[PDB]
Design a protein around this nucleic acid. Structure first.
Ligand SMILES: [K+]
Ligand SMILES: [K+]
Ligand SMILES: [K+]
Ligand SMILES: [K+]
Ligand SMILES: [K+]
Ligand SMILES: [K+]
Ligand SMILES: [K+]
Ligand SMILES: [K+]
Ligand SMILES: [K+]
Ligand SMILES: [K+]
Ligand SMILES: [K+]
Ligand SMILES: [K+]
Ligand SMILES: [K+]
Ligand SMILES: [K+]
Ligand SMILES: [K+]
Ligand SMILES: [K+]
Ligand SMILES: [K+]
Ligand SMILES: [K+]
Ligand SMILES: [K+]
Ligand SMILES: [K+]
Ligand SMILES: [K+]
Ligand SMILES: [K+]
Ligand SMILES: [Mg+2]
Ligand SMILES: [Mg+2]
Ligand SMILES: [Mg+2]
Ligand SMILES: [Mg+2]
Ligand SMILES: [Mg+2]
Ligand SMILES: [Mg+2]
Ligand SMILES: [Mg+2]
Ligand SMILES: [Mg+2]
Ligand SMILES: [Mg+2]
Ligand SMILES: [Mg+2]
Ligand SMILES: [Mg+2]
Ligand SMILES: [Mg+2]
Lengths: 94, 139, 65, 378
RNA sequence: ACAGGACUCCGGGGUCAGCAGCCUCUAGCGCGGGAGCGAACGCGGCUCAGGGAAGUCGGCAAGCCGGCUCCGUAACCUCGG
RNA sequence: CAACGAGGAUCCCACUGUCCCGAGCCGCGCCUCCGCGAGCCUCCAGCCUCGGGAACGGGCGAGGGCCGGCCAGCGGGGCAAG
RNA sequence: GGCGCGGCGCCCCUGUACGGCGAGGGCGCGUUCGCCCGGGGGGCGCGCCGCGGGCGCG
């Protein structure tokens, strides 16, 4: 099917919340942002996403993450590894 | 005849940095070292509010134990000439000094010393002509 | 317009900005912002603060007339 | 027993209740009084709050300690794109106050006015003035309907709306407001003047003048539910009070056995309807003029928008007005401006020597983008 | 039925005067449940220009001081402090 | 009367949000929702002013007010409860 | 009130990035220094554009 590519700013999604639960709240915001993007209701994440989001503890989560959504059947998300995010935007294929 | 109260002209309001209980330095050469401020003239108060003064105001003081024996045990008039609380002038300038200071001067406007050390403010030099003439610097 | 130069850095100060300080040796100092005033009071050397006029002059990046 | 020491009550009981305002925007409740014979003129306008800056001006007073010196003053900037006059209303003075005769609308009504009649515009079926436009097509009906206002009304007002496609705002529907026509020689001369404004734009330079005083009407910043220390300004209780010190301790005597309306209580603070009076006009200009904010004292060309842009407002595109001091509301609230009902008497004239255009995002030190570039020229 | 009460044994590493505090290898992993919002007000905390006990029955509470080395230490004394 | 004291007092230096005069911020409760789910108390009721009255009434005489149903808060009254 | 998400520019905050190369008290080692470099990082303000943004209930 179709395959998206998208960055999500994670420091912006934990604004206004206690830092003692930043990583759990980031996990719940990736799902909400992916589900709108891909127009679905069921988001299976890959553990590569989990390992990246949690890689600096529960408080200080990485600033940006680069995703890859595969529209299947639901939506399936794996972590895409990049050096920097200089002028990266939404890339839709298929 | 001969009335001549103290304080020539009108003054705009500025920030008051010194409330009752403050201890400031003595800037003239009368013999006093520190002055303990106990009241402000022209002060109508309000419930619970401490009286307070700024540069140019006339205050009542007592000379502390480090000052000369003759000056002690008396309620003496004085004028504040330097303060540390920063204040705004009409032309938009904000200005403050390094220390708090005053001179001993009677309400007729005659000083008890011959000199003033360090700079003084323009607020105190305009209201009190004798201060403007024996000061070495005005800021 | 009429302007001043910051005494800690070398920048220009526009009407209605910053604050002045009267030192006790009868010398006036004009500060651009609170940052510049905190640097002066702590006794941080102007030449070691790399964004000042004094530093760039000592580093060859600023031409001295 | 009697309260032992003397002390006034806290706060003003003439601004009760402290409820949220239910009027939508600021509403002008009074107009300046008409003077039979005076030249005709308009009395009101509607703008949006853009920002604050400060100016340098030369004071020409007499007896003042600033008599021939320079002062730095705070000014507020209000964005005022031209308004469109769309209708005329008349009223009669009767033994029951002001009662209206009829309202005569224009033949052709614009999109910003039509959107104010609907909740959602895209979805709605559009049946506003559908019959009126057909009848009013021939201009004869307007003349007959104006044939009544000349014969029965004592007061004439014009209906006018703003154009929100010339601002940085988000709304697309206009704000509609009546503006009273004062002056003139008789009623019949104020209806010939109102007709000559129908479907036409009106600029703020043609209501207010420089050095006159105005009143500003708006809705204040909101803070939500707030306790007595902040809402009312009562004294804070001592440190070892068991259950907290941000309260009024005694809220009434035993008799009368009720709580009085004069006692301070917690509740909604802010978002109130307010009027601040006697504001002096500093400048009336336009943002297209690139020389609008340049005195001789500076040689570059400076205009109204600051380096970086108006923080939390957006860009100003056309006309604006500048008042001394402050006015209610946050940035982007609509502000009503009227002539001063009882103006202050001993106000000096306006003589501007300098205006600040440096950046308000942070602590900006450059009047213009051009000379910042010259500063960091590598 | 439960932040209470309930004797003893074995006791690694780093920092260190140390069985103190703080971090950790081995071993072990509950604690009448979750999500949203970020009002008042509370409970446990943090910072505040200028003044410095004027507050209060009363310096209550909070803050200042503090490790190690060298210098320098009065009145009085039962001659030990 | 030296030394000693979680003992009772007065003063000074230093220190400070004790105070002039308060302001902003953090976590957790509160608040809204899914699941779970109690105590105390109760003649009948629950808006005021005056009069008379077991001499300070929600009810009685006379006047003035008031659709009805609820929430977050609060401590004047119910001569509130124990 | 067809949202927003994510970018690029401006403007601000901090104070000159990692690395490469060439001064350093001393004995190949070396705290630190200079240069590329008002740099690098960051943004909740301003300006313009890749993915997208008009159901169902009365
Ligand atoms: K002071
Ligand atoms: K009393
Ligand atoms: K009392
Ligand atoms: K109070
Ligand atoms: K009462
Ligand atoms: K009340
Ligand atoms: K009250
Ligand atoms: K209250
Ligand atoms: K008002
Ligand atoms: K809430
Ligand atoms: K409250
Ligand atoms: K005291
Ligand atoms: K204590
Ligand atoms: K002894
Ligand atoms: K003892
Ligand atoms: K004992
Ligand atoms: K004891
Ligand atoms: K507060
Ligand atoms: K009676
Ligand atoms: K009675
Ligand atoms: K009774
Ligand atoms: K009672
Ligand atoms: Mg008191
Ligand atoms: Mg207590
Ligand atoms: Mg208690
Ligand atoms: Mg600002
Ligand atoms: Mg303080
Ligand atoms: Mg006392
Ligand atoms: Mg007292
Ligand atoms: Mg304060
Ligand atoms: Mg009863
Ligand atoms: Mg009855
Ligand atoms: Mg009660
Ligand atoms: Mg470098």
């Amino acid at each position: 099917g179709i395959v998206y590519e998208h960055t999500i700013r994670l420091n912006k999604a934990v604004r206004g919340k206690p830092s003692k639960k930043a990583a759990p709240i980031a996990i719940r915001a990736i799902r909400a942002q992916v589900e709108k993007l891909a127009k679905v209701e069921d988001v299976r994440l890959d553990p590569s996403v989990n390992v990246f989001v949690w890689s600096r503890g529960i408080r200080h989560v990485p600033r940006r993450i680069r995703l890859e959504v595969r529209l299947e059947g639901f939506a399936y998300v794996i972590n895409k590894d990049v050096e920097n995010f200089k002028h990266l935007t939404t890339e839709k294929k298929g | 005849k001969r009335g001549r109260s103290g304080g020539i002209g009108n003054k705009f309001r500025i920030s008051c940095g010194l409330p009752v209980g403050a201890v400031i330095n003595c800037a003239d050469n009368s013999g006093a070292k520190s002055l303990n401020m106990i009241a402000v003239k022209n002060w109508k108060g309000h419930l619970n509010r401490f009286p307070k003064a700024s540069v140019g105001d006339m205050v009542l003081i007592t000379v502390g134990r480090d000052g000369k024996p003759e000056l002690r045990r008396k309620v003496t008039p004085a004028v504040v000439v330097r303060q540390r609380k920063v204040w705004r002038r009409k032309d938009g300038v904000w200005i403050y000094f390094q220390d708090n200071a005053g001179v001993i001067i009677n309400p007729k406007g005659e000083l008890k010393g011959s000199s003033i050390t360090g700079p003084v403010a323009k607020e105190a030099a305009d209201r009190w002509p004798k201060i403007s003439t024996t000061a070495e610097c005005v800021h | 317009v009429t302007t001043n130069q910051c005494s800690y850095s070398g920048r220009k100060i526009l009407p209605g900005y910053g604050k002045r300080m009267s030192r006790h040796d009868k010398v006036l100092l004009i500060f651009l912002n609170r940052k510049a005033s905190v640097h002066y009071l702590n006794k941080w050397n102007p030449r070691k603060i790399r964004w000042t006029l004094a530093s760039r002059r000592a580093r060859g990046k600023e031409v001295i007339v | 027993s009697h309260r032992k020491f003397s002390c006034c009550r806290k706060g003003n009981l003439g601004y009760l209740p402290r409820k949220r305002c239910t009027r939508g925007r600021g509403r002008c409740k009074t107009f300046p009084p008409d003077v039979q014979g005076a030249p005709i003129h308009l009395t009101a306008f509607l703008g949006y709050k853009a920002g604050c800056t400060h100016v340098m001006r030369f004071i020409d007073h007499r007896g003042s300690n600033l008599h021939n010196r320079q002062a730095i003053d705070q000014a507020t900037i209000i964005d005022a794109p031209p308004m469109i006059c769309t209708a005329i209303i008349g009223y009669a003075k009767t033994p029951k106050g002001l009662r209206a005769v009829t309202t005569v609308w224009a033949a052709h009504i614009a999109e910003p006015a039509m959107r104010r009649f609907y909740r959602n515009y895209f979805h709605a079926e559009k049946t506003a003035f559908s019959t009126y436009m057909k009848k009013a097509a021939d201009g004869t009906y307007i003349k007959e309907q104006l044939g009544r206002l000349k014969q029965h009304a004592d007061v004439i007002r014009i209906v006018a709306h703003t154009q929100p496609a010339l601002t940085p705002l988000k709304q697309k529907k206009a704000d509609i407001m009546e503006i009273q026509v004062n002056g003139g020689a008789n009623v019949a001369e104020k209806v010939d003047y109102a007709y000559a404004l129908m479907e036409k734009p009106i600029s703020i330079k043609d209501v207010f003048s420089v050095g006159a005083q105005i009143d500003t009407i708006s809705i204040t910043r909101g803070r939500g539910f707030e306790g007595v220390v902040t809402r009312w300004g009562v004294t804070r209780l001592p440190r070892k009070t068991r259950r907290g010190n941000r309260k009024v301790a005694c809220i009434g005597a035993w008799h009368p056995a009720n709580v009085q309306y004069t006692v301070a209580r917690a509740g909604q603070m802010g978002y109130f309807h307010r009027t601040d009076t006697n504001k002096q006009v500093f400048m009336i200009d336009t943002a297209e003029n690139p020389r609008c904010c340049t005195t001789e004292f500076d040689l570059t060309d400076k205009s109204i928008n600051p380096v970086g842009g108006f923080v939390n407002y957006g860009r100003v595109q056309g006309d604006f007005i500048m008042i001394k001091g402050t006015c209610p509301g946050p940035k982007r609230r609509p502000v009503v401006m009227r002539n001063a009902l009882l103006p202050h008497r001993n106000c000096p004239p306006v003589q501007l020597q300098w205006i600040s255009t440096a950046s308000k995002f942070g602590h900006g030190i450059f009047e213009t983008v051009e000379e910042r570039r010259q500063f960091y020229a590598k």
